[model samples]
Target chain A: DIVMTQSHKFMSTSVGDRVSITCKASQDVRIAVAWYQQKPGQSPKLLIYWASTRHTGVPDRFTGSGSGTDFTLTISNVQSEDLADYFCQHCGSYPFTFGSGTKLEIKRADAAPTVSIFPPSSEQLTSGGASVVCFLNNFYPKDINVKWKIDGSERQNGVLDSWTDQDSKDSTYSMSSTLTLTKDEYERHNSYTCEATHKTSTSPIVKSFNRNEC
Target chain B: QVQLQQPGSELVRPGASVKLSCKASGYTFTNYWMHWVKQRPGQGLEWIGNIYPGSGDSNYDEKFKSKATLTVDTSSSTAYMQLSGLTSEDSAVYYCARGLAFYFDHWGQGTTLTVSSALTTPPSVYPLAPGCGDTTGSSVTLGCLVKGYFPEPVTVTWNSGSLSSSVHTFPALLQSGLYTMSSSVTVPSSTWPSETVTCSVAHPASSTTVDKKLEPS
Candidate 1:
């Protein structure tokens, strides 16, 4: 059977505080390591697996990144309901093994916690100025890097973006990023991406959208 | 839309035997695989094994290789897991699950079984690992194994002094009416130099607990 372990038994952080957990296997189990969160009396929820592929219907803020023997599960900003034990299990072997678990705690703090993202709500379309706005919603990153491409042509200067830090009544952080494309530069059905690259973590979270023919 | 309504409870005396059954509804009886799981009180889930009614091929968790057996009746669409050699600790909730792509995705509510007394003849004890001590740092496994029990759930716990951990391994194959559950734990390096570890076996009808202890080298 494969072996698994976590870095800590529990972690304490205030709402909006960035939280992270580490899951290590006996050896390089490839991307077989999967993460799950179990609330009291509830079935386990799949968080991240195959290394960084997020499960469907999960929130954007819950992102996973890692490779080989070392893997990481990060919650951009913590929430009260998220105050539960998190465990990591490996499907690489016959009898899958699970990491003990790391409990996340709500802490006391001032200014609460602030999470930010980019891009503005509306934009004008001009043939030469035709632009597209990229939407990154329900994400919890402070600063996300965006790249704009037109018909496969990488445009560094044509990209403009902005971020706003929004909090729910419960104090969980929600952020968004919008990228604008020049109207004339926008190609109908052209692919655009809002990529959030974490400097300290393992994998990158990226979402790609195409320009509407309208 | 097929649903499985199973027995909610069962009772057996130590040294006797117990049989549990799962009744299926809503789907074709011969089309799917019926599986079993053991969830002892306050313990994690263990996949006892799977049973295919069409071909009669079965797979069980290696830890339960000797303690559990699998069988199916195509005409009835019912499956069973019978456990023998009962002990107080063998009591647990056994569930019948549906096997999808060789994985257990759906499960029956489960049946509860308790061992009351033992029979005149005791089942033989088979140890997967012998002389394995429970001392800290000792690298060894203690196992409890028995056979011929069908349609019953089993439990395996690793106990040393007062410390113990449950095993959560999946079974390899289910066949005949045989099932097994063997508990194991890794000896901590801090206390293994001179300690003993034992793996105990409990079933629905065993007269006494069967255990194997290992001493550190």
Candidate 2:
């Protein structure tokens, strides 16, 4: 089977701008292609199938066209929500392959995110369990990565949920994540930290809370 | 509104086998193919394989064919993957996703698996610890050096009070294929305080953690 190659690793554009991404197949695969959109922290969504046909409910602004060994996906009058990673795949043979993703980033006037830490209630902290909320506000382009740490070490568990709120008119966003820990952890004076990374910032925005403070 | 529920983590011994499960709900389980994906810490995503519940048809990435086997049980709307001959390299996070038209639309929360060999030696953290430097007018930098660790990736962090500093990490391979790493953090001078500064390190090869504290001096 032929491999799919995406030459561009990152593509930047602004709202109302048009952008085109190309994918090349190692060998001839005539019209057996698909395009997908993967937002940060989300599963990939099929945008186009069979080379040119748009998937059901896909936006009209997104179009796919090409054939033979080369294919293209074009977005017109791109909206802020359209910023995501785009990938192409060939299904003409066994062991299907996907191109390395091309991250579509929005170029806009940006603002630093306001970070806050909400510790669990005093009663919960004294008990065996607690929940902490890390809130981020007034960020642009909506794509961000959030991580949780305990006493300066990366932790995988304790993250219960994460979500975002978007401003329709200004195209800015706010997001939050909640982490739950055990009483043993709190009694140990472990410090819980939430770190947020965005394309707009050179350094991650961090907010931490010590259980002893509660 | 399809959903996949998976276990949080697993620990297996080297040369052993493990069977991971993914339970699906809210949609016809047989209607979509179930695909498995693997992600090593700080690494890119890799597709493992996919299995159709209705027809029992399956396909796998050539790299994973010898290491993994994919199966499904339609009666319970669940998918399973069995990985055999576990090794240190097999330690990674695994996720199950529902496939439609060559894309994955719904993904299960990932499950992390750690494989420790019988001959594996526990990791050790150095005692010399980290020190702060470059006390310029605006900022002070904290540097930590860690050594004698097995496995390639480890989590390192720097903390003071309620604020955590971002760290830049560098890892070098030793002659034995073990690793040594250094992490650094820089913060504004105004933020320094009577509070304690700590460097924490954690790895999957060991259950306990190592912490070094830097008090005001």
Candidate 3:
């Protein structure tokens, strides 16, 4: 009835430095943790099982400890060859879930989204109302709050928003939020805006459009 | 605005046949291709076949050609698949989805079939939750699946908070014994993330019932 989550999205260290990766259960799991080491292009290797017991042939440097809700897997004198992933499993439950895995390595950074807004197409306007689409692209780290606004008011009733997965080979994200304005709303509102709040910015990257511009 | 309403699970004895129906709504039934998929427990999805509702013409993976018969009722906006000579091998979940006309993007909650000899298995129901799927306009659809039951006549409904104008429930298909059913509700794309829905399963066999809460992520 609980969740098992990794304490780190990633762990970093010098080749000779020590690293401790962690996993915590939402309930008291006692000593039922199993640790695994996974390198790219391979399946996971059992490094430790049932808390701190090492699997056959695992380097002594890789160790597991702790109990109940908190658990840790420590690697002493880490090597570059060990720059991989660490995953932990709580063996006591069904609905079995594993830690998201902590990568023992350095990290990269995020990119700011380039944003733009477009007015409705001729056919889109052919209906009783029109839709204006706001597009945000060239962004990394996928988490962003996108919104549509009309004349300073957040337009919530007729907006449809969705995003894409890492769509580019370079690993960036893209998203769009379309605001459907009733003909009356479209004609009366002079300012339609798209504002995005993402991990890369303190201020949302904003873009705007209006019928006059269309 | 595409909805595929699938009837519930089935239970058939060996050496018999069963027909499953999927009613199409929100879209012109005959305009797109209706596809069927099968999943044996502990296995991956197997594409059984496709039926063009407009022409009433059909095609199946060579493997399923012998096991499944696909047809449509344009008048009722429904598609049907009849499986012949039931065996432990044919007992599985079948899903009806729209378009091959690239993937089965628009899906039915899936109807499960059980070919039983003597034992009775109660249904296991799980929440499918809601997520936006290739949404072309303003609505987001979310639902759940039920399994391993042979005909207690399972009835599924949603307890939520955009309403049920988009909700549909299919009665269970008979296999000569226990039953299974699944259901869902649709909400506006704008109001979705803030709305939550719960799948309420009423299975006579499961004199005991449990409600599961789901969030739109």
Candidate 4:
């Protein structure tokens, strides 16, 4: 049995700092290691492959080292843009795995998003049915958690959502989710809320879609 | 946000049909479309079709127009494909993807589809005695060849003096779904005649292991 373990869940590092993320394999895998850097709203990009050989176009500052069961990826002079998630993969065995990511969060950097649950749109303005929408705006640091709750419970047969955050014209970020509810549930339910949890807040902001609000 | 459980692997005799299930998890499933793809053994991918979960709507490539039927269960958030009229050419890996305007940027994990002919014949093993013709030097090579074994990849282990020995077993070539494979063992000629080597041939298709001695006639 082989497993990949990244000891750190969040690594705090500032600009010009050298960031090190290490991963350990449960069994000897020689050097079948690879490292990837992932940013918000983007796919993970390959930084190192075949152990220490950097992928083409990868900068020299990203160094990969170690063999056998232990491996480390070092990002020299980690930039603000590098304040993302890094994960490692061991491609040597059956049931190969990816490491739990290490998010490179710098000190004195964070903000909470303003949460709001908008009523039905023009499309759902009629009596046929309604789809409620939720928005999270003006957030700093792309990481955020969002969910929809009905009377404090987080499940509905008709409700579902997907996550994809977008950047604002300003340096802040924004995200949105939807609740596809029919007319019957909309009339039956009293409170439909949008709750957001951010690191800066340390607590979630719950804003409901009140019938008379809009 | 999505996963295809059972992770895409299947095996069935040729001419039979196989159904594969692609389950979604963590992500909300609704009007979004689910697409299927086929990648033959060691080749590029070919799009199969995309099916809408909210409604039973789908469009397929002309090639897979009649080959695969793509369906989804919005209740369970799982998509399934039933492949009919299978053949060796039908043996390929299938991939499930989220759809809407061909944006397959992220993919559901792949599943393997293995379709092959049935194993209808047993094997006949013949072991060759140690010979100097195979020995230009002090080493002798004992060999065994199996014939008429249905399917490929049977195991041939060499036993020297009734004890397990190392070997070089090459996969048998395919002929109309049957196989012919051979295995060889290396032994020094210094004690060749004193050795009584055995060929232990086993095939999953036959569900039996046969042993034959390789000694002087």
Which has the better TM-score: candidate 1, or candidate 3? Answer: 1
What are the lDDT scores of the predictions, listed in order? 0.55, 0.70, 0.67, 0.66
Candidate with the greatest lDDT versus the true structure? 2
The TM-scores, one per candidate, come to 0.42, 0.58, 0.36, 0.41
- Every candidate's CA RMSD: 27.4, 12.9, 21.3, 32.8
In every candidate, what fraction of the native interface contacts is reproduced? 0.01, 0.14, 0.00, 0.00
lDDT by residue (B1-217, candidate 4, tens digit) is: 4554635356688678877887887667675777776656433345577787888877776677678898888889888889998988888768776644333323565776767756456787766543221223565555665656775447787773343333444435554455655565556766556756788888766586888876642
- Chain B alone, TM-score of each model? 0.52, 0.67, 0.58, 0.59
Predicted candidate 2 versus true structure: per-residue lDDT over B62-169, tens digit per residue: 898888999998899999999999987998889898876365667788778878743334454432211222123565544444544665456776763333554344
Tell me candidate 3's fraction of native contacts, as a decimal between 0 and 1: 0.00
Ranked candidates, highest lDDT first? 2, 3, 4, 1
Query: What TM-score should be assigned to candidate 1?
Result: 0.42
* DockQ, every prediction: 0.01, 0.09, 0.01, 0.01
**How well is each residue in A59-113 modelled by candidate 1, as lDDT tens digits?**
7678887778888888887777787778786767655567877867555322211
User: Stretches of candidate 4 above 4 Å error?
Assistant: A9-12, A37-46, A83-108, A125-127, A140-161, A165-173, A188-214, B1-217
A1-214 in candidate 4: lDDT tens per residue? 5678888888867668898999998888898877767664334556887789887677898999988988999999977778777878666742335677777765444667655454543333364455555556556776787777877778544443333322222345555455656777776776678888888886788777555433
Question: What DockQ score does model 2 reach against the true complex?
Answer: 0.09
- Which model, 1 or 3, shows the larger lDDT? 3
Encode model 3's per-residue lDDT on A65-144: one tens digit a residue.
98898899989998767877787766565333467778766322578876656554443345555556555665777678
Tens-digit per-residue lDDT, B1-217, candidate 3: 6778887667688989989999998988888888786766533345577889988777676777688999999899999999998887887778887763423446686787878784566676555432222222475555544444745556566674335645544333333343434454555767655655677766665464556566542
Which tens-of-lDDT digit does each residue in B1-217 have in candidate 1? Answer: 6677778777687666677888787777666777776766544555577777778877676876766778776787788787767677678888786644244444576787866442333333343332212222234333333333433444445654364532222221122323322233434545433565555655544444666654422
